[PDB]
Amino acid sequence: VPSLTQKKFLCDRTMWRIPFSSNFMSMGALTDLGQNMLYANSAHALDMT
């Protein structure tokens, strides 16, 4: 009897992460994208849906 498929992922016990680096790498605690001349100068409100 014919069928479709269903796909789903399971990520328990850990949190999703998004690093604040412009290449997204874990190069250090500080990042290149965190201490540049744009985010250390000015204040920035964020909207996050």
Binding site: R17, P19, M25, S26, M27, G28, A29
Partner: peptide
């Protein structure tokens, strides 16, 4: 290094 991440 004790840190949550790199």
């Amino acid at each position: 290094a004790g840190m949550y991440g790199g």
